[PDB]
Amino acid sequence: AVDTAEQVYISSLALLKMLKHGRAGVPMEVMGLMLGEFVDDYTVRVIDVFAMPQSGTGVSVEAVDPVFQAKMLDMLKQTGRPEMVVGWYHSHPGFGCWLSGVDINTQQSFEALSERAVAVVVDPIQSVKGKVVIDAFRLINANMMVLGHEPRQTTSNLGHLNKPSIQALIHGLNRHYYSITINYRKNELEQKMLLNLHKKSWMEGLTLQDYSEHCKHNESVVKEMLELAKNYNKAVEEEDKMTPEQLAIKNVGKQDPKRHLEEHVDVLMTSNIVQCLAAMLDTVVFK
Amino acid sequence: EEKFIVKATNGPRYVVGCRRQLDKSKLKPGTRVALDMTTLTIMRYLPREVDPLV
Amino acid sequence: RKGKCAVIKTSTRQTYFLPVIGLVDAEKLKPGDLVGVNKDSYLILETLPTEYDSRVKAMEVDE
Amino acid sequence: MVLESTMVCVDNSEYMRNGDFLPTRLQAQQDAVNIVCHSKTRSNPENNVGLITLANDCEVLTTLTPDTGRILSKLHTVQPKGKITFCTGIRVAHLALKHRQGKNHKMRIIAFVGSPVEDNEKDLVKLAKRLKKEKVNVDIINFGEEEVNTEKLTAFVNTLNGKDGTGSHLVTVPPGPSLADALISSPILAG
Amino acid sequence: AVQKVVVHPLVLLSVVDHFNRIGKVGNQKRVVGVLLGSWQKKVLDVSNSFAVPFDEDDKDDSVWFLDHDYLENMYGMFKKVNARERIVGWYHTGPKLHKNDIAINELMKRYCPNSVLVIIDVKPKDLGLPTEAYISVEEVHDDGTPTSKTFEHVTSEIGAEEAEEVGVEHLLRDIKDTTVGTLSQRITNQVHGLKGLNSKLLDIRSYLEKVATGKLPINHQIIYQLQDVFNLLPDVSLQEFVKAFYLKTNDQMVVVYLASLIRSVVALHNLINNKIANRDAEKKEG
Amino acid sequence: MHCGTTSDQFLRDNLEWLARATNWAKFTATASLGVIHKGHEKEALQLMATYLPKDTSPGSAYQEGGGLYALGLIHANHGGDIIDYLLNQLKNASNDIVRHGGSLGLGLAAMGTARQDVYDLLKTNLYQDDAVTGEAAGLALGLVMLGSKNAQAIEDMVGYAQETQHEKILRGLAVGIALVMYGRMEEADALIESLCRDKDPILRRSGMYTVAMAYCGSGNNKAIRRLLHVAVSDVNDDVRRAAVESLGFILFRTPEQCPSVVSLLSESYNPHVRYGAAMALGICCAGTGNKEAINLLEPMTNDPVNYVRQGALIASALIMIQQTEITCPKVNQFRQLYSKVINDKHDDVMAKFGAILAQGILDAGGHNVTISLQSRTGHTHMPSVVGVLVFTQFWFWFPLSHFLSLAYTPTCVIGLNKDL
Ligand SMILES: [Zn+2]
């Protein structure tokens, strides 16, 4: 009878594999298996994550083929992947990320070997593209109902675990079903390779190609955007002619939610492209 | 011209975008089209017909 | 890039979109009912002609 | 039982269809591969057997696996091109021994040589020094000949064969109309 | 045949995994991975990929080790779980193109269709684009050399469709979006000269070295087009472009009037509230 | 409240309220007992041995680990240390109790000795790659290496940092290399400046925690540039909430100048800079009577985030100590601090933790003992700064708050003429 404060390490491998698996996350139930290595009690690291073929039955213990699982795991053992399985993941579209009776039964059956048995449910269907916040699930012991529910130390990270604060699922089904915190990790090779890879993904090939395109489109296409920009500017100035009357009458309180200032600041920012690219044309013409 | 309003058979209405493959030929209004559950993209249209016309 | 499609109507009065798919079809492609369909993929897998209005189907069932 | 890997190198030159010897003995040594793979299967079915030729552009026909059901099919379509290649024929398997699944399987590589060797004695002592260095069991089987059978290959084997106690054996077959199966099955390597 | 390709960062992060699962052995050779993609459409789209144990020899370069059963099993199971993607080609992490790559690529030319080749760098120190699509096609040469496999550079782009943009953006939390305006423009206008300076300066030095110290024909025929296009801009006297400088400078004047006038409009609320707020708060404070 | 007075009679009421759960709560209970009584050469070891002198096999080893950690709390900076016996007791092989608690107790008892023996056994104690015994090994190595400045130790720790994946080893060696740096103002410029650009955020916090005690006394106006520059510029909130602790540790001299420059950080962008800034107001105005933080405590105590509420109650608890009501109107923070234990039903589980934990600060020692950041001559106390920084290190590991008793400086007078 002892418990610690565990935290699931999530690298970009399992993340991107759950993003491609979320793209393949059809309404039909899907299956997946997580791998890794157990170094101590209160830490768990995932490295290898793959997908499983779909079945008409869906998420179930019968769909997990032991000769296929052990066959692929053996083919990972003959390669440079000497990691044992650490858990299984799946997708729950529509009805929420909670776990049904079948999922908790195959979780109870799959947790006999690994005491941790990390469970992750990805649901990118109804989640907006602004946040990719994912949560890992855990199974509590049925004999711990007499004593405290979760005797987990280091209660600081629970404030970060309070971000999924839906008022129906977390404490709507929190009995006999709790969760765990999630952190990330990134080395310098992922930082510089993925950082320079994304900057290059927003940059050009030689980085000098599409500059003169806009530098010379300022004279052909942007002129229409400058004339229309002046049409919006005058289209606001026609009301700014009426503003000094109200400002000359009341001077107390603000009733119009429009600021008429920051939009024109943005118009000036779009208009400064001519100034910033004029020096570019000066460099291209010079040398 | 790029994004228009669609009317589903079930009753609720939505708005969709334009796919990079198709053009504005069949995109004109008055032509029944098809949509996708993910991203509400447009694969192709749906030509109308009738029962005795079959 | 050949044109081939079909119009589907579920029992719950919901219309979806899908092309003509499945196995080798000989007596299929007719406007009938009782076809094979999965949970949400809505594909055609097993088509078999169906009755209903049993008042005419079971007119005189004699072996 | 015996845990070891088996690698065979067969010749695909046109020197294997001459009418003086057996009638296209390629099938005969194919049956030799069949009886040694089925014999090792009867001894220990967990042994993996690879298949590769000695042509200029060496191609792995079958990965090391105990399932010979598809190896029987892969023994066909020999593509009779090229004459002989020795250096990358040794290096294509002796260096590929590290890709096996079972690390406990000992290293054993045989080869069917049906063409005269093009490498000089310097390459024979460098490759023999490499194979004796890495300590791999090497069985040399020479089918057919034009010049004398073993003139420099004798010193090639004597300098290549280390661990005189229960070490490797040399297979030298003389001319004769009899089959090669019983003649190569005489040493202890078969069985 | 193919004009451009699309490579997702998932395969390059799988090369990060190639550099992760090494195990500190001391080899770090050009590990060859089996590239996967969609060859159906004219444009190539890489979704994911996997690897195969690949080992070469120290001295002899012609040694190469591949696997057919592992390729048919990983490709068979991957096709069983996802049949929308099939084999297309391969890629190596080595920075130098060796001679054995014709034999390594020849296997996937025989068994698989025309394979595309991608050369990347083991260390992400290169500022340029790490991915270069090299099509494996045989071209006829004018000098009379026998027909051989030629690797022509196909342009490539690094883009993500739906989710990898969100995952990368959440994992970084340091990179910025387009953000048109002052900073995103002036950073490009500052570092662009180094972005061309490291490329040109890095290339013309070994180029000039191979001019005098070069043999084994390097296709000197294309050098005539090189210096030709370089001499297609013979220091124009700018006589005709003066009126174009009057047009672009007149647009500059338009930006001057827009900035001065619009900012003069912005000065209204500031230069009014500064008085009416201070004098009323002061006269009503006590 | 029972520190120094050795009043175990409150814990003698019943045994079902302490040993009812087998977890770290009993370790913190025995460590708290070590905070209760201190300065005993016979009643300490005898009192720890009298608890179960029957079979010499306790079912819960947290009593033994808390006996070693509590003994280290008792014999802190004493001249009659039992370290010689603690080496033969540390030689015994046990599961993480003598390692963690024995390392903390032995390192605290051997603080400032700079002995190479505790360095060797400490290194062979951290050579097991474990994060807990390496965390306690770092906490003990920083204490024992006070002023030693060994050549191979810094490079061995920073070299031992990036070769492991655990985080408690990185924070333990972070405080380990942080506390070792004292008086190296003219030395650690290139070390901290070089280690500031490290890719590891934990070590990035270790550079600021390390430069905190190095620049005490407001002797360097340069480190604040990169302290606030990494507090605002960096995207990770670890160095952002761990940044301004060095700012308070170097600017502890003037209590008035702090709220003028941290008032912007009171209500910052993210709640992490609000919490770390709450620690900054807690450490900079402690023991003083400056109301420039007290008038700013009212906006800190009301916010949907429980972090700024917890650090707001702690910062409010560090100022109200040693203060009379007739001088300043403290009724607001007394009443709002008293309403948290009755309002705990509708509050968070950690908000009541920091609430009653903040209420234990004023009642500490029965208003007799207090804390002080500097001595009477103006010099600052080393165990006071160590005790307050480790006291602020309770976020990652809560049982580390037991080192607050090292900063308790009772305020009184002495008119002792003769020794007897
Ligand atoms: Zn479901």
A213, A226, A227, E247 from A220: Cα distances, Å? 11, 11, 12, 11
| Distant-in-sequence, close-in-space partners of F370: CB < 8 Å, separation ≥ 6 | F287, F321, F322, F408, F409, F410, F411
Determination approach:
cryo-EM
Q: Enumerate the H helices of F220-348 as residue ranges.
A: 223-233, 237-241, 244-250, 257-266, 271-284, 297-300, 306-317, 331-338
In angstroms, the separation between the Cα of residue B8 and the nearest Cα of chain C is 9
| Distant-in-sequence, close-in-space partners of B3: CB < 8 Å, separation ≥ 6 | B15, B16, B17, B18
F297, F298, F314, F355 from F352: Cα distances, Å? 18, 18, 12, 5
Residues of chain A in contact with residue E192, where contact means CB-CB under 8 angstroms, are: 207-208, 211
Residue of A nearest to F304 (CA): A159
**Cα–Cα distance measured from residue A31 to residue A55, given in angstroms and rounded to the nearest whole number:** 9
CA of E11 relative to ligand 1 center, distance in Å: 31
User: Is the separation of the CB atoms in D31 and D186 below 8 Å?
Assistant: no
Can you read off the two tokens belonging to residue A81? 């992947």
Can you read off the two tokens belonging to residue E243? 């009126």
Cβ neighbours of A33 (radius 10 Å):
19
Distance from the first to the final alpha carbon of chain A: 76
In angstroms, the separation between the Cα of residue E24 and the nearest Cα of chain A is 11
- DSSP characters over D52-96: EE-SSS--EEEEEES--HHHHHHTS----------HHHHHHHHTG
A224, A283, A285, F170 from E245: Cα distances, Å? 19, 13, 10, 60
- Torsion angle (degrees, nearest 10) of CA F346, F351, F355, F358: -170
**Cα–Cα distance measured from residue B15 to residue B52, given in angstroms and rounded to the nearest whole number:** 32
Residues of chain E in contact with residue D91, where contact means CB-CB under 8 angstroms, are: 57, 60, 63
Interface test with F, best of A2, A10, A38, A39 (most F CBs within 10 A): A39
Partner-chain contact D60 E68, CB within 8 Å: yes
**Among candidates D142, D43, D44, D37, which has minimal Cα distance to D86?**
D142
Residue of C nearest to B42 (CA): C17
- Torsion angle (degrees, nearest 10) of CA E132, E136, E142, E145: 120
N residues, chain D: 191
Q: How many CB pairs under 8 A join B and C?
A: 13
Q: What is the DSSP letter of D173?
A: P
**Cα–Cα distance measured from residue D5 to residue D93, given in angstroms and rounded to the nearest whole number:** 11
| Identity at D153, one-letter amino acid code | L
| Identity at D64, one-letter amino acid code | L
Can you read off the two tokens belonging to residue D90? 């040794």
**Cα–Cα distance measured from residue E32 to residue E51, given in angstroms and rounded to the nearest whole number:** 7
Residue of C nearest to B35 (CA): C17
∠ Cα C57 C61 C63 (to 5°):
140
Residues of chain E in contact with residue D87, where contact means CB-CB under 8 angstroms, are: 60
Interface test with E, best of A272, A286, A287 (most E CBs within 10 A): A272
- DSSP characters over F327-377: TS-THHHHHHHHSTTTSTTSS-HHHHHHHHHHHHHHTGGGGSEEE-SB-TT
In angstroms, the separation between the Cα of residue B40 and the nearest Cα of chain C is 13
Burial (CB count <10 Å: 0-12, 13-18, 19+), residue F13? exposed
Residue F165 contacts A, CB cutoff 8 Å: yes
**Cα–Cα distance measured from residue D30 to residue D21, given in angstroms and rounded to the nearest whole number:** 16
Partner-chain contact A237 E265, CB within 8 Å: yes
Q: Beta D137-142 vs D49-53: how paired, if at all?
A: unpaired
Q: State whether residue D190 is helix, strand or coil.
A: coil
Binding-site entries of A for Zn(2+) = 90, 92, 103
CA F95 to chain centre: 25
**Among candidates F260, F258, F237, which has minimal Cα distance to F318?**
F258
Helix pair E9-18, E164-172: axis angle to 10 deg: 60
**Cα–Cα distance measured from residue A178 to residue A170, given in angstroms and rounded to the nearest whole number:** 8
A176, D181, E205, F20 from A142: Cα distances, Å? 7, 68, 72, 20
Partner-chain contact A276 E276, CB within 8 Å: no
**Cα–Cα distance measured from residue F228 to residue D115, given in angstroms and rounded to the nearest whole number:** 79
CA E159 to chain centre: 10
Interface test with C, best of B9, B40, B41, B49 (most C CBs within 10 A): B9
Q: What is the DSSP letter of F99?
A: I
Residue A28 contacts C, CB cutoff 8 Å: yes
**Cα–Cα distance measured from residue F173 to residue F140, given in angstroms and rounded to the nearest whole number:** 10
Burial F230-256 (b: 16+ CB within 10 A, else e): bbeeeeebebbbbbbbbbbbbbbbebe
What are the two backbone dihedrals, phi and then psi, of residue F213, each rounded to the nearest 5 degrees?
-75, -20
CA of A224 relative to ligand 1 center, distance in Å: 52
User: Is the separation of the CB atoms in F382 and F409 below 8 Å?
Assistant: no
The sign of the dihedral angle between the CA atoms of F263, F265, F269, F274 is negative
Q: Which of F23, F165, F350 sits opposite A155 (nearest CB)?
A: F350
**Cα–Cα distance measured from residue F175 to residue F210, given in angstroms and rounded to the nearest whole number:** 8
CA F109 to chain centre: 16
Residues of chain E in contact with residue D119, where contact means CB-CB under 8 angstroms, are: none
| Distant-in-sequence, close-in-space partners of C43: CB < 8 Å, separation ≥ 6 | C18, C21, C22, C36, C37
**Among candidates F119, F112, F129, which has minimal Cα distance to F87?**
F119
CA of C9 relative to ligand 1 center, distance in Å: 23
Regarding chains D and C, contact by 3 or more CB pairs under 8 A is answered as no
Q: Which of A13, A131, A277 sits opposite E17 (nearest CB)?
A: A13
HSE value, Cβ hemisphere, 13 Å, CA-based, for D35: 14
Host H or E run for residue A44:
strand A43-52
| Identity at A249, one-letter amino acid code | I
Q: State whether residue A170 is helix, strand or coil.
A: coil
| Distant-in-sequence, close-in-space partners of E176: CB < 8 Å, separation ≥ 6 | E183, E184
The sign of the dihedral angle between the CA atoms of D164, D165, D167, D172 is positive
What are the two backbone dihedrals, phi and then psi, of residue E267, each rounded to the nearest 5 degrees?
-65, -10
User: Is the separation of the CB atoms in A24 and A30 below 8 Å?
Assistant: yes
**Among candidates A136, A186, A130, A188, which has minimal Cα distance to A157?**
A136
Residue of B nearest to C30 (CA): B54
**Cα–Cα distance measured from residue F362 to residue F320, given in angstroms and rounded to the nearest whole number:** 7
Residues of chain E in contact with residue D89, where contact means CB-CB under 8 angstroms, are: none
User: Is the separation of the CB atoms in D30 and D179 below 8 Å?
Assistant: no
**Among candidates F371, D14, E237, E245, which has minimal Cα distance to A278?**
E245
CA C30 to chain centre: 8
Partner-chain contact C41 A26, CB within 8 Å: yes
Q: Which of A16, A195, A240 sits opposite E167 (nearest CB)?
A: A16
**Cα–Cα distance measured from residue D159 to residue A128, given in angstroms and rounded to the nearest whole number:** 72
DSSP bridge pairs for D142: D113, D172
Residue B38 contacts C, CB cutoff 8 Å: no
Residue of C nearest to A58 (CA): C39
Q: Which residue has the tokens 């540790």?
A: F249
Partner-chain contact D88 E63, CB within 8 Å: yes
Residue of B nearest to C7 (CA): B46
Partner-chain contact C39 A26, CB within 8 Å: no
Burial (CB count <10 Å: 0-12, 13-18, 19+), residue A72? middle
User: Is the separation of the CB atoms in C44 and C5 below 8 Å?
Assistant: no
E-state strands within A153-221: 177-180, 182-184
Resolution of the experimental model, in Å, one decimal:
5.7
**Cα–Cα distance measured from residue E171 to residue A19, given in angstroms and rounded to the nearest whole number:** 13
D7, D8, D164, E65, E199 from D136: Cα distances, Å? 11, 14, 13, 19, 49
Residue of A nearest to F305 (CA): A159
Q: Which of F21, F22, F306 sits opposite A159 (nearest CB)?
A: F306
Interface test with B, best of C2, C16, C20, C43 (most B CBs within 10 A): C16
Q: Which residue has the tokens 């170097």?
A: F250
CA of A7 relative to ligand 1 center, distance in Å: 28
Q: Which residue has the tokens 């079930």?
A: B10
Q: Which A residues in the span 51-80 are in contact with E, Cβ-Cβ below 8 Å?
A: 51-54, 68, 72, 75, 79-80
| Identity at C32, one-letter amino acid code | G
**Among candidates F271, F240, F396, which has minimal Cα distance to A163?**
F271
Can you read off the two tokens belonging to residue C45? 């897998």
Q: Which residue has the tokens 């759960």?
A: F21
Residues of chain A in contact with residue F349, where contact means CB-CB under 8 angstroms, are: 155, 158
Can you read off the two tokens belonging to residue E142? 């004018």
Q: What is the DSSP letter of C63?
A: -
In this complex, the chains that touch E, judged by 3 or more CB pairs closer than 8 A, are A, D
Partner-chain contact B46 C17, CB within 8 Å: yes
In this complex, the chains that touch B, judged by 3 or more CB pairs closer than 8 A, are C
**Among candidates D114, D117, D118, which has minimal Cα distance to D15?**
D114
**Cα–Cα distance measured from residue D173 to residue D22, given in angstroms and rounded to the nearest whole number:** 13
D28, F210, F284, F403, F406 from F390: Cα distances, Å? 82, 13, 15, 7, 10
User: Is the separation of the CB atoms in F334 and F320 below 8 Å?
Assistant: yes
**Among candidates E95, E102, E149, which has minimal Cα distance to E125?**
E95
**Cα–Cα distance measured from residue F280 to residue F289, given in angstroms and rounded to the nearest whole number:** 16
In angstroms, the separation between the Cα of residue B36 and the nearest Cα of chain C is 9
**Cα–Cα distance measured from residue F111 to residue F142, given in angstroms and rounded to the nearest whole number:** 8
**Cα–Cα distance measured from residue E245 to residue E243, given in angstroms and rounded to the nearest whole number:** 5
In angstroms, the separation between the Cα of residue D65 and the nearest Cα of chain E is 9
